[PDB]
Ligand SMILES: [Zn+2]
């Protein structure tokens with residue numbers, strides 16, 4: 404409590420002394436309340452006109468149109484403390500997992516130089532506006548770094564002054580750029596040096612890309628065992644216990660010098676003790692604290708969620724294999740059996756999983772896993788959309804398993820070679836490309852975002868008839884040499900001015916470890932589609948009157964957009980298709 408959060412609270416109280424008041428009608432039960440002060444202010448989703456003008460048939464599909472119109476009673480719930488047996492299982496497993504992750508890696512501090520480059524190339528670090536306008540301006544002004552140094556030396560002392568969260572199935576907690584830097588210095592190595600790559604972590608997929616995930620699921624499917632299980636958790640970030648935050652901190656045991664102390668401080672002072680400011684309309688600013696749940700930076704959140712999720716799923720596996728009998732209490736001989744399992748088969752059991760933060764696919768040794776629920780429920784990782792004690796429903800086919808919002812098809816080229824391609828309902832893909840976030844978008848910038856989406860569709864979704872055609876139309880409608888842009892930046896190989904057929908060959912043939920024959924593809928017509936009936940199942944409008952009219956008359960839609968943008972240098976990409984090729 405207050406000897407760690409006090410100083411932070413004291414400092415804010417004073418800056419709004421003319422507004423302070425301990426409000427008695429406060430809507431908090433599970434958060435600790437501290438006081439309120441006067442504020443008044445709020446960002447909605449705008450339509451990309453370039454993409455909408457080249458996707459007319461979809462102007463009458465509600466699933467697409469509604470996406471562009473528009474829980475904080477789940478952040479106010481309290482997780483129970485686990486049993487002693489559960490806590491023992493978690494500490495042993497965490498201890499062992501950090502050793503394994505650390506066998507071929509060296510913890511190290513990230514640098515101002517490294518941080519500066521990040522900001523000067525638009526990564527979404529989640530900072531606030533005020534003294535300097537943007538992030539960019541603050542990074543050259545030596546004043547900033549004197550503030551950063553004040554807080555830094557404070558953290559070495561073991562106290563905090565300026566590290567305070569701002570809260571705006573999602574909940575995003577911005578800090579000021581300074582506190583983001585100090586988080587990056589101490590914990591950035593996890594992302595920057597790829598601790599959760601598949602090579603290093605065996606379960607993880609950090610930096611793999613959407614064109615590898617299908618191949619990774621199929622490799623898992625090849626192992627002997629039961630169904631593939633893919634249970635989603637209900638509000639994962641709100642079910643992170645203090646015991647979870649403590650096992651995460653054991654990464655510091657692998658550190659030394661300044662680093663160990665700086666990392667210890669972030670975990671102690673910001674993660675395991677939180678100070679947050681929230682807008683309430685009855686408008687005031689509420690200064691609340693609590694000890695548990697997740698609210699770090701989105702990139703460190705990712706890596707820590709993967710770590711804790713790896714830990715939970717190895718434990719659920721142990722329960723299915725009958726390594727321990729009850730969560731109430733671990734005997735002495737059970738501790739040695741758990742430790743022996745991890746040493747004998749742990750690495751093999753990690754390779755049976757694909758884990759991306761809160762998202763997992765598990766192919767266990769057999770189907771006992773399905774009704775092994777006691778550890779999972781007691782750790783607080785309650786399954787979404789199924790009764791607490793009802794057994795999990797597994798999948799019998801790797802092409803039906805959901806993972807990172809996709810499913811994966813197996814697709815045979817005319818030359819016999821095999822692609823594994825990502826897919827989702829086509830209304831979701833078209834609906835997202837019609838949306839832009841923010842204000843002050845020039846026509847040129849709107850066009851360049853449209854082009855980023857088209858290049859993505861050509862590289863990942865080439866097998867959907869409607870998306871190859873819409874992609875060709877957009878790349879024809881936007882000046883050939885204008886560079887694809889994005890304001891909120893996995894592997895993004897479509898962000899480039901290089902020839903898209905040359906990128907396709909590098910990604911799917913040259914650099915693809917699942918493809919033995921390296922024979923380049925000479926044109927887009929060598930590159931196959933899903934079956935027509937499969938394309939309709941995944942949402943294609945192939946076979947409708949509206950869709951045939953759009954395709955027939957596509958050069959008229961292309962010319963409409965060219966007339967609005969003006970007299971520039973354009974390329975016709977539509978003769979790359981068979982039906983437009985004379
Ligand atoms: Zn601090």
Ligand SMILES: [Zn+2]
Nearest residue numbers: 810826827941
């Ligand atoms: Zn599909």
